[PDB]
From a paper:
Among those, A33 is a 23 kDa, homodimeric type II transmembrane that undergoes both O- and N-glycosylation (N125 and N135).
A27D7 MAb engages A33 in a drastically different manner compared to A2C7 and A20G2. A single A27D7-Fab binds at the A33 dimer interface, with the L and H chains contacting both A33 subunits. BSA for both L and H chains bound to A33 are larger compared to A2C7 and A20G2 (L = 525.3 vs. H = 630.2 Å2) for a total of 1155.5 Å2 (Fab:Ag). Sc values of 0.71 and 0.74 are among the highest Sc values reported for any Fab:Ag interface and indicate a highly specific binding interaction. CDR H3 is centrally positioned in the A33 dimer groove, and contacts residues of both A33 subunits. Binding affinity of A27D7-MAb to A33 mutant Gln173Arg, however, remained in the picomolar range (KD = 20 pM), suggesting that the many contacts formed between A27D7 and A33 can compensate for the various single amino acid substitutions on A33. Conversely, mice treated with the A27D7 antibody were fully protected against challenge when the antibody was administered at T = +1 (P = 0.0004) and were 90% protected (P = 0.006) when the antibody was administered at T = -1.
Residue numbers in the entry:
A (entry chain L): 1 to 214
B (entry chain A): 99 to 163, 167 to 184
C (entry chain B): 99 to 161, 169 to 185
D (entry chain H): 1 to 133, 138 to 220
Write the structure that this text describes.
Amino acid sequence: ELVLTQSPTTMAASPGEKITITCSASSSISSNYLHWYQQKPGFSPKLLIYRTSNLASGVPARFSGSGSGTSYSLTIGTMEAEDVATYYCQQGSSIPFTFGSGTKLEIKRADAAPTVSIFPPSSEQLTSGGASVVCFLNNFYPKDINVKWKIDGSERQNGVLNSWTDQDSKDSTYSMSSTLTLTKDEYERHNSYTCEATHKTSTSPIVKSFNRNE
Amino acid sequence: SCNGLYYQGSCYILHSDYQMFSDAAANCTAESSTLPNKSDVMITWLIDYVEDTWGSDGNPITKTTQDSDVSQEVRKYFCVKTM
Amino acid sequence: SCNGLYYQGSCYILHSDYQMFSDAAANCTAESSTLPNKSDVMITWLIDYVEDTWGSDGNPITKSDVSQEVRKYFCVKTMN
Amino acid sequence: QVQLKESGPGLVAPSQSLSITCTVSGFSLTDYGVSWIRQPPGKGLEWLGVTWGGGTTYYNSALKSRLSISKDNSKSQVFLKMNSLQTDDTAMYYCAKHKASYNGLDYWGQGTTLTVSSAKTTAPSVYPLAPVCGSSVTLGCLVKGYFPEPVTLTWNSGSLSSGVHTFPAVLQSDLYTLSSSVTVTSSTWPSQSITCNVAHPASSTKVDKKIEPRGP
């Protein structure tokens, strides 16, 4: 097959600055058969550039494409917050039709500390026998973050489920959710519940806590 | 004597150079011709050729019934003249 | 009576399914027709139409290993 | 208006068969090609096959022996059938319309989620997250212990979208958990109510959980 290799795999682009991503084919393609798609998390891909360089409906003029033979590229003239997405090239000349390996574009912005919120278990869950404690670590930058759970002042590692968002298209931040699950009985046998967030914005963690008996 | 496609009294000559709409229209006018009228080309075999080329109203000829916000839109075009 | 391109006694009929070469050639044969000859078309007004469609030589008509490539094609038949 | 809509079984057991229907409108299947493309969770796009207007059909050879495509022009339906399903086949399945030339894909369906697993379908429990005890307040909803994907979640029937974070579902063993946070001006809550709306089509679940301002 005609394998399309995209570079880089992930790119952090400076705001308002020109950025280019590349698509390298294992076999030569006529430029009419090379297209680009944009995909945002939770949505279908959308046709972005057709026949190497022709912008699709609704695509801002800051987008462009160029190339020939085995080497193609997509350029954004000025990186905008809403341009964060994964981009795929595709060839339509030979079977099997193939998509590129994908490039995820992210955007740079000022460092931001996470807004941390902690939530005790609901009565619905408690009365059914379960107990999940939830911590949101919201709207931070850059993306690297660690969460530590403590029960009664000591680290708790098991029973944790973590999920992270991709970059927000509006404010260019990242968010994370962390859920610690115990049974109601186990939850009631301890008092202090703490989530600690370690991020580059501080040498000290951002900490949220509650005491069950309060 | 039609160096192109013949349909219902008119000859359709292909111009393979991609142009913006107004340039395509100008070029047909230079040849005492017009761009295809969408109501005149409603036959499958002909649309197979004329699809995605400029119609006389500034929209592409299509087998559907937009896609109308295209930046720097360039298309091929046919120039049409009565035989 | 040629619903396509008429040139010097031959009718060129466009087939719009993208097909591999062998499939395209088999279709024209079934239609008692041939694919365009690249030499017959290159110096003519047909070239802009038949460019990048299958030639009878197994290659897309212009102005490598192509066995997996898919293209549209014309089937050509003489009119008498 | 061009539309494509996938409809699939959602969950199928390993080694069983799969059938997905793509129903199109706004164009004729005799006039344009339609391709099937899939995307495993967090992965890239894999083209599966195509059927063109005249019926010409080609496949990805990495799957050809296991995959078939057919269509009904009169009913505007394209079909994808797969046999001997494996875990790897778990993916979002899309159908997409081809442009008239060059095999770009101009219109895509919203996709159908397909999971290959022996695990049981299970409805989520939907739990309110309130500060049961600044200028902003954060609330949430915990959508716990469901299978398979997907769920949909909105706040106040979609009228509350600013300051929302809905976190991708995570699978642990045979059950998913998802969560969502919503942040509003503190003075507005609980005076103005906030409700998370959760749908899990696989279990015919529709839940509206109001975040009640319960105390300690």
